[PDB]
Amino acid sequence: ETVQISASNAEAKAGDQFEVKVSLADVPSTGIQGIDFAVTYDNTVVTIDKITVGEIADTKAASSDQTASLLPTFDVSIQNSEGYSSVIWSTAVEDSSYWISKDGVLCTITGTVSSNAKPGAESPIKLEAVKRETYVGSGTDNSSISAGYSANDKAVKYTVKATNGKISVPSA
Template sequence: MKATKTLAGALALAMLASTAVSFQVSAADASVTLKGAKVEAEAGGAFSVDVSLADIPSTKINVMDFAVTYDNTVLNVDSVKIGKSADVDVSGDSTAADAPVFNTNIKDSEITVSWSTALGSTSWIAEDGVILTISGTVKDDVKDGTVTPIDFAPVTRETYQGSGENNKSMVIGYVNGKDAASYTIKTEAGSVTVGKSGQTTTETTVTTSGEDTTETTSKTTSKTTAKTTASEAPATSDSKGSETSGGTVEGSVLYGDVNSDGRVDITDAVMLNKVVAGAVTLDNAVQRKNADCNGDGEVTGSDSTVLLQFLVSIINTLPYTE
């Protein structure tokens, strides 16, 4: 397969206000708690840290997108395995073979975590408990008493390819038809303490490119809140190479931005799965163009698979064609 290098069209966010899919909380003040366990391990020895969710709302979860951060000068992370609460029955999800429902990627000092399914709510995450377990070893030269954090942050990536703006949000919530929610995320960092209990501790820190995300508040993605305006958007080219000025909706396309919020993330993948399943209808030509992730002029299950592959870094560009 060959990836094309074109990702054309900066959307005029303000002009798309009337077509945006609201991403908001249905239940007032709905929130979840994302927390890491605090464990002990010997220098040169193995460690295992559980990451859990607590206070899951009754509306459940079918989309998660966040990063786990750690100090890779202290820890070697070898594996990330799904936990019991997230290991629900998603055997009927047709995209899972190509882009797993649960996916992680270990890179430098960040573990990207995504979980999404377009199946019905019986296959959503509903129970408090462990969603993943991180395992590895402490490096040999780490001093006893060192405490190194296991923390949480937005995944390090652009809001869309070429945007020049980093993602600043963690997402835990749901997409159900055109109803969607991003819960408030409260975080409790975990840690690995090197040596035996009761020793003097030395704190280490983890530096990430994201903003402070100790608590992320619920928000909507209505275009009326977007900072980009038609006059600010640069001239771009569409997939056929014709020039369009930023701010002109006709002919512009941001592949993967199915909900027209100016960014490409896991909520778009869930919505696209629902489009393919016939549960959601795209309202306008811009959304239909954005959903054509393989560039074949149609919106099918292949587009859903390609978008999921893009989000979990199996492929690096959209549209992606054979």
């Protein structure tokens, strides 16, 4: 099975804030217990201020999973100086009704266009795998976005199709 993930486009002046919606489509009926992806960008043009949980990930898992208070279900790490932000959603709850199960907004990105950004300038907002090794000392990077679930402690991993977004600055 397979699932689509995509980032919307935005327009904003230099120094202004913008929003980008990250959406899932064709979420399998079996659901998503864990999902992991990176948002990559050019930090001379944009920086991310926050990333907020979306409607489809706003389930009972966040408040009922025992380990949620030790590590939040919707877990974000913004790395502007490294030119990326990493988004992980996961849960140990077995009840599939508490997993991500519908198409819609996964999360909302809020960022700021550089004060220096000249008119017409652009920057892609790409959705891709976090730059890390497959395992420690492997010497090979993680190459795909992760999305799926576990049954009998065995991973069922969906294929992920990514559509990137864009931020552009108008003229005056």
